[PDB]
Design a protein around this nucleic acid. Structure first.
Ligand SMILES: [Mg+2]
Ligand SMILES: [Mg+2]
Ligand SMILES: [Mg+2]
Ligand SMILES: [Mg+2]
Lengths: 149, 61, 67, 138, 134, 213, 101
RNA sequence: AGUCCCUCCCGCUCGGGAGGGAGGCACUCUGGGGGGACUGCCGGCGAUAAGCCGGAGGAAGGGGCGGGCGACGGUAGGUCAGUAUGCCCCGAAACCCCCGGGCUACACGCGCGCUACAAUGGGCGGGACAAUGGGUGCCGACCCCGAAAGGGGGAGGUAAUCCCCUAAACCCGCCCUCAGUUCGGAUCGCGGGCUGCAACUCGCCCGCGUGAAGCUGGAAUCCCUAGUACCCGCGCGUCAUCAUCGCGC
């Protein structure tokens, strides 16, 4: 019943709530006064703009094996609107992801493989697919083909 | 050296510059530090036009 | 109003911009029902379509022998 | 309880608008400043402005007269390193005007280059002029 | 037993896999029922909806595909599922009804893109600049 | 929206998984052999037809409808007065939004009456395709206006284009959204109301056609 | 052993297969295995330039091109084969290199 | 891909999934050699000819689709300011260097384009898949210091090996609703960086402020026949640095 089997934002939204307890994780002290990057144009609007980010960083690497920073600044960018001029792609800010992976390791879900990138521990796999299974355990109420697989 | 950046040395004083044909008097006051030297020596005289002539509009070709 | 007539032969294309088409068709019903006339049509047509007309007496004007 | 007009730091605003927005009307504060003062006062950023008592917006103005003294940092304030005293200041309606004109009068006092394009009134930031900015008459 | 199948549409390769089983089918990790471009989720169900729900009660299928775009993978996958179902039971009527509904589910696609040209070079072979009198 | 539908599963070979073409009736015989009615669930064909002559005859009708709103509108011949050049915020190639909006439009039709939507399209595109118009003929070196009859296929295509244009003209900077902006067109076309638009163009074409017979 | 791997890379496609099959033959001539020639990504370099010297007239464009061919062959290390691959006397428009892993 | 071990999770496990290693090149791939459509078979004219019509069969149909190649002569069109080149000129100069200013001036006429005049939307945040090329003066995987610009160590690479590289329109939830606005973002004020023998005239980026013309556009004219036209990004040339351009994707 692994994460390959469920829609994305559902599992994301889901884990984003019960991730409120782990006293490792909290918003840093430049949290409210910062837009997330060179492709934002407004601020974070909703309140739990921290926990969603921590979570959707959790989901990524699990089904992605070994990775690092310079690339996660390369999924999390968006077309900026540079003035009178045409549009161009960009990378995003990093200090976020930095403190993020710090507090996430300190939780214990991940670990650092030297010179190769980062990985997911057992704790992370079980913690994820648990909530995965819980989620599939009610969505199947209303669409009868989640039964067969 | 038009690209001097004036300092506590020269506040008040009087040196020249070069602007394309000449030397030029620039005398120093406070508030100048932080600027360059050449910033105060213009290079292209202003223009006060005459009148349009031949061709300037597609009737005159 | 709704009168249909059936296309039985295409004859040629006239019009200063190559648009009308010479087509001898037959009326199928009505006070005539069987008289075969001469008309020019607009659009593309195939031998075997079902055209509606509205006057059943217009008798379109002749062509330069189609060529 | 509902009032429809709340007057804070000079110019008022309606009480039908989201509280992060309508403060936009104070000359010298936009959106990406606004959510900051909102979240450092500690009050919802969505609420319809028509729900404000008095002492709150009192605090609001208080922050508005020293953002740095309470957590608003020193790299988004309306003039860092004030050229007359490098302190951190964010100004508003009454007094920005004064600042723009004094900082014009500076270059108007020394006959530098940059002033010449305020005086003679054409662009200062190094565009051209042989094709556009045709602002008068034939 | 097992059989393996392919197909290509505008540079989007599709490797299909078949075998006996229960009636589930996945793609690149995805269960079919979870595909947000529904106008795609209908581009691959049709050989799974004409075959009848019963042959669709006996099969395990997973596909691996790559290249192209989210509307380009769908039709390669469709070619996959069809050229597979035609060998699993491999009778004749079930090729028949796969002809009436559509053709290129079988005969392969020859439609391939085009170079560009040296006049705008950034749009296409036949969109030039805009001419200039006066 | 609701996840009961957001994920859908068909086991019935229909169109759009909601409605089907078995009992509709076009009355007007001139248009009968020219409106496909085979099941053809997915209305998307990738232009494998507009290459040989008279190929585009056999397409299911909803597809010919869905493609023919991928338009900023008209950009070189005025409509309702103004031009509606909307460029770069259009729907030109983005068929996705087209499918989506037409889905919502059909569901809105189904509500406010409760009938087979596509049969309602049948009533609509029966009453906006005229049956005569004009040209200029060369007769002796002198050329001038005359009138002739319109072949079916052109009736069909002009009909659909006028409907699309009309509906795409009540939304221009308008609180009304695009979806119901469609429905308020097919409805009126089926009610031959003067205030409609598709009926307007048939009426004002045949009028000035008979003005110079 | 050690899997010495030789290389080839030329421009005249014809004059490379000749020596490819030459080594194929010798490595067959003596008793020792040899992996077939491994074709590799052909290599191309595209250079365009404006066909007119001045700036008048319309602008018309050239497309010069030059494709680089690569091959690959693995052979065992039998010194009786080392000695044959030393009397190769290649054509001039081919480059060979030998390096054992 | 199908077989085998090892290792890790889940409804505790009967089944599901996923990482390595050893074996196979079956399948995609890379590429040399090969076969593959000829109006060929019939249907109809046209002489019965050369032909075009037609319909089958088929991966393809009647130049199979797209490019290279441009006859004689002109065009006193162009370029001696890419190299060559007759004559006349300067010849201590009209030669060769250096430090500075200039091609970047500004009531206005016109050409080619970018951003828009909001609902076929704007903004938050989640969720999806691409292709041609390039690399040692350069490319740079990975780690910690900054809010962002960047700086700090730098593993691995001269190439199907490591690197440039987890595009965008796209989908889904929330706020905004006929407004010169949450449309549009000129224009100007501060302050922090980059490369550079040298950034004021005259290079480039980013943080905060202010918030201009603009409500689809007269008489005219332009571009397009199928993976074409429209819409959305990327890679090269340029190059110590800046792409609203050409050129391919
Ligand atoms: Mg001449
Ligand atoms: Mg110039
Ligand atoms: Mg805006
Ligand atoms: Mg400058």
């Amino acid at each position: 019943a692994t994460v390959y089997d469920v829609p994305g934002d559902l599992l994301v939204e889901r884990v984003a709530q019960r991730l409120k307890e782990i006293p490792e994780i909290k918003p840093p002290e430049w949290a409210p006064f910062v837009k997330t990057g060179r492709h934002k144009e407004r601020l974070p609007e909703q309140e739990d703009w921290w926990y969603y980010r921590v979570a959707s960083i959790l989901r990524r690497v699990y089904l992605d094996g070994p990775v690092g920073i310079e690339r996660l600044r390369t999924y999390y960018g968006g077309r900026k609107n540079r003035g009178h001029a045409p549009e161009r792609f960009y990378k995003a800010g990093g200090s976020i992801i930095r403190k993020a992976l710090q507090q996430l390791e300190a939780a214990g879900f991940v670990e650092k493989v030297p010179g190769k990138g980062r990985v997911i521990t057992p704790k992370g796999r079980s913690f994820l697919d648990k909530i995965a299974t819980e989620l599939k355990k009610e969505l199947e109420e209303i669409i009868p083909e989640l039964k067969k697989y | 050296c038009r690209d001097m950046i004036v300092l506590p040395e020269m506040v008040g004083l009087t040196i020249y510059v070069h602007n394309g044909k000449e030397f030029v008097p620039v005398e120093i006051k406070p508030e100048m530090i932080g600027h360059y030297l050449g910033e105060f020596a213009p290079t292209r005289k202003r223009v006060q036009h005459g009148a349009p002539g031949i061709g300037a509009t597609r009737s005159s070709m | 109003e709704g009168y249909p007539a059936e296309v039985i032969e295409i004859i040629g294309r006239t019009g200063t911009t190559g648009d009308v088409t010479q087509v001898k068709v037959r009326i199928l019903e009505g006070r005539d029902k069987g008289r075969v006339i001469r008309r020019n049509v607009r659009g593309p047509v195939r031998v075997g379509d079902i055209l509606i007309l509205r006057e059943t007496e217009r008798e379109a004007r002749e062509i330069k022998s189609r060529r | 309880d509902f009032r429809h007009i709340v007057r804070v730091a000079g110019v008022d605003l309606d009480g039908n608008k989201q509280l992060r927005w309508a403060l936009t009307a104070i000359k010298g504060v936009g959106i990406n400043f606004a959510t900051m003062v909102c979240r450092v006062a500690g009050l919802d950023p969505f609420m319809k402005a028509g729900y404000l008592t008095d002492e709150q917006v009192k605090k609001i103005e208080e922050i508005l007269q020293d953002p740095v003294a309470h957590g608003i940092p020193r790299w988004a304030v309306n003039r860092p390193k004030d050229y007359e005293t490098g302190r951190d200041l964010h100004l508003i309606t009454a007094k920005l005007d004064m600042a723009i004109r004094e900082d014009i009068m500076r270059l108007r006092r020394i006959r530098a280059y940059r002033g010449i394009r305020h005086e003679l009134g054409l662009p200062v930031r190094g565009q051209r002029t042989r094709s556009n900015f045709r602002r008068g008459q034939t | 037993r097992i059989i393996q199948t392919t197909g290509k549409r505008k540079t989007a390769i599709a490797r299909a896999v078949i075998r006996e089983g229960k009636g589930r089918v996945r793609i690149n990790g995805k269960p079919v029922e979870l595909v947000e471009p529904e106008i795609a989720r209908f581009t691959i169900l049709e050989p799974l909806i004409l075959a009848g729900e019963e042959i669709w009660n006996s099969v395990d299928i997973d596909v691996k595909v790559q290249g192209g775009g989210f509307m380009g993978q769908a039709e390669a996958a469709r070619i996959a599922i069809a050229r597979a179902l035609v060998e699993w039971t491999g009778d004749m009527n079930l090729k028949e009804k796969f002809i009436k509904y559509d053709r290129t589910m079988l005969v392969g696609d020859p439609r391939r893109t085009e170079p560009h040209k040296p006049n705008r070079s950034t749009k296409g072979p036949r969109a030039k600049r805009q001419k200039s009198y006066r | 929206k609701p996840l009961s539908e957001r994920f859908f599963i068909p086991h019935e070979i229909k169109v759009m998984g909601r409605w089907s073409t078995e009992d509709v009736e076009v009355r007007d015989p001139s248009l009968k052999p020219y409106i496909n009615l085979e099941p053809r669930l997915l209305p998307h064909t990738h232009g494998r037809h507009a290459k040989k002559h008279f190929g585009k005859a056999n397409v299911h009708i909803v597809e010919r409808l869905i493609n023919k709103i991928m338009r900023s509108g008209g950009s070189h011949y005025k409509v309702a007065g103004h031009f509606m050049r909307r460029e770069h915020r259009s729907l030109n190639s983005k068929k996705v939004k087209a499918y989506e909006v037409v889905k919502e439009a059909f569901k809105i039709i189904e509500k406010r009456t409760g009938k087979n939507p596509i049969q309602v399209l049948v009533w609509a595109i029966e009453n906006a395709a005229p049956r005569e118009d004009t040209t200029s003929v060369m007769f002796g070196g002198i050329r001038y206006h005359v009138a002739v009859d319109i072949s079916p296929m052109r009736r069909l295509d002009v009909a659909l284009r006028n409907i699309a244009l009309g509906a795409s003209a009540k939304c221009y900077r308008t609180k009304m959204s695009f979806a119901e902006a469609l429905a308020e067109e097919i409805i009126l076309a089926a009610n031959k109301d003067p205030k409609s638009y598709a009926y307007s163009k048939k009426l004002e074409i045949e009028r000035i056609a008979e003005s110079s017979r | 052993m050690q899997k010495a791997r030789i290389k080839l890379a030329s421009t005249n496609v014809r004059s490379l297969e000749e020596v490819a099959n030459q080594i194929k033959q010798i490595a067959e001539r003596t008793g020792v295995r040899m992996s077939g020639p491994i074709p590799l990504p052909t290599k191309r370099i595209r250079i365009v330039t404006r066909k007119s010297p001045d700036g008048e007239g319309s602008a018309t464009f050239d497309r010069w091109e030059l494709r680089i061919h690569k091959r690959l062959i693995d052979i065992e290390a039998d010194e009786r084969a080392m000695r044959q691959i030393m009397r190769i006397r290649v054509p001039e428009d081919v480059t060979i290199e030998i390096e054992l892993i």
